[PDB]
Amino acid sequence: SFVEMVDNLRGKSGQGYYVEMTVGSPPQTLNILVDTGSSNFAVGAAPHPFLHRYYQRQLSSTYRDLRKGVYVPYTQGKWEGELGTDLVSIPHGPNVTVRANIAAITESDKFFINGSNWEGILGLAYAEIARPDDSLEPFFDSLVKQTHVPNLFSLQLCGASVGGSMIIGGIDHSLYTGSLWYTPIRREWYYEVIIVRVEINGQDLKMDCKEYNYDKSIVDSGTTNLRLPKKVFEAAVKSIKAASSTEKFPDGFWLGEQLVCWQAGTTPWNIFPVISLYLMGEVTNQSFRITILPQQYLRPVEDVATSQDDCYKFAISQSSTGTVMGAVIMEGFYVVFDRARKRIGFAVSACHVHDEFRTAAVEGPFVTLDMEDCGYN
Numbered sequence: 001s002f003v004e005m006v007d008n009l010r011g012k013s014g015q016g017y018y019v020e021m022t023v024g025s026p027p028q029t030l031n032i033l034v035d036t037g038s039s040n041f042a043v044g045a046a047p048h049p050f051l052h053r054y055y056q057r058q059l060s061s062t063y064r065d066l067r068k069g070v071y072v073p074y075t076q077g078k079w080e081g082e083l084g085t086d087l088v089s090i091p092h093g094p095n096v097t098v099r100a101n102i103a104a105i106t107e108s109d110k111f112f113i114n115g116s117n118w119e120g121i122l123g124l125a126y127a128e129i130a131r132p133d134d135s136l137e138p139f140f141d142s143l144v145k146q147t148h149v150p151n152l153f154s155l156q157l158c159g160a161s162v163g164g165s166m167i168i169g170g171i172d173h174s175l176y177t178g179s180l181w182y183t184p185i186r187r188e189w190y191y192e193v194i195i196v197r198v199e200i201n202g203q204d205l206k207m208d209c210k211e212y213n214y215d216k217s218i219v220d221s222g223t224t225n226l227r228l229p230k231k232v233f234e235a236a237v238k239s240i241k242a243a244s245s246t247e248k249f250p251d252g253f254w255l256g257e258q259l260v261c262w263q264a265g266t267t268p269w270n271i272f273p274v275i276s277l278y279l280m281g282e283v284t285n286q287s288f289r290i291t292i293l294p295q296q297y298l299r300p301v302e303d304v305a306t307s308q309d310d311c312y313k314f315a316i317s318q319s320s321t322g323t324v325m326g327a328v329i330m331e332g333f334y335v336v337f338d339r340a341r342k343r344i345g346f347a348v349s350a351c352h353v354h355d356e357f358r359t360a361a362v363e364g365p366f367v368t369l370d371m372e373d374c375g376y377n
């Protein structure tokens, strides 16, 4: 019954993928950002310059106030609100209705994005990082307890406006090619994984693999960029700089601020390297790798000038809170959040990136010794 859920995600590039949901009786329809990097379900519940619509608790006969406040600070933006429960459905999802925790957003700061077209956020991670604390049952936990939906979902994010699929309750084999490769969920809070090796154009970065996961590595559809710990980010940028030194870039381009542009159709893709992330596998001493094309980490953006050129922003940036495999990494791939088996699966997506001579890939097996040493403690 998964064909009903294919193509149920929309978005604008860099502004988040959202799914249509309804809350309340009678159903109020809202676009909800799909976020594997948090665990709170929350919706605009008051006017805002960037909201075309919002949740009106007064109009819902099934609303229940929880008489508790809540606030969530993300890396980017924050909101506070009022906790309640209400009936929730996903029109292009499974045919079910759950009573779910809902944070009604009454104030926010740099949270809603102008033109993103979504009015709320669906945190799909685990209770441990839910606010105000882990007793607030996240939406997907509610869905699995109250219905027969199996305890897994999958994300096919298609890149640069944008669309994709969230398969709730299973895997749709028509959305990927090749084999699924699985990496363990190291701990059920974020979707934490372990990166065991990093290569740029086939050259090992030759860092202690603890640096890749300092202090954690997560799969986060709510973040746009590949974000890397400071030491790793410097090694990678240095290597990406050297591979493309044929051309000149402002040094604020490497910080994500300034664009770079080229005459339409002349982007020198060949001079940017591929990046390979090796992930811990399912069996002893075994890993696999995912390979990222420059078309994934050079995100296309609107031409700031009066021209019609190809302009790009650098979508690898620095982190002080660990590695974040953002939407830009996920776009190459079909990603299975197999919560029931504590693992995350990767396959080449059917809507994969297209280079002339190079291809995004998920390949294994690889042998990697001492993988447990790559986790940070």
Ligand SMILES: COCc1cc2cc(c1)C(=O)N[C@H]([C@H](O)CNCc1cccc(C(C)C)c1)Cc1cccc(c1)OCCCCO2
Pocket: 014, 015, 016, 017, 033, 035, 037, 038, 039, 072, 073, 074, 075, 076, 077, 110, 111, 112, 113, 129, 130, 220, 222, 223, 224, 225, 227, 317
């Ligand atoms: C250099 O890039 C920075 C950056 C860019 C960015 C979003 C985030 C960060 C962002 O913070 N996104 C969070 C995710 O939940 C974050 N996940 C990890 C996390 C970090 C801190 C605290 C928590 C707890 C709440 C669990 C969780 C979700 C979010 C919040 C606000 C807007 C948004 C998406 O718009 C989606 C489009 C992408 C917008 O671009």
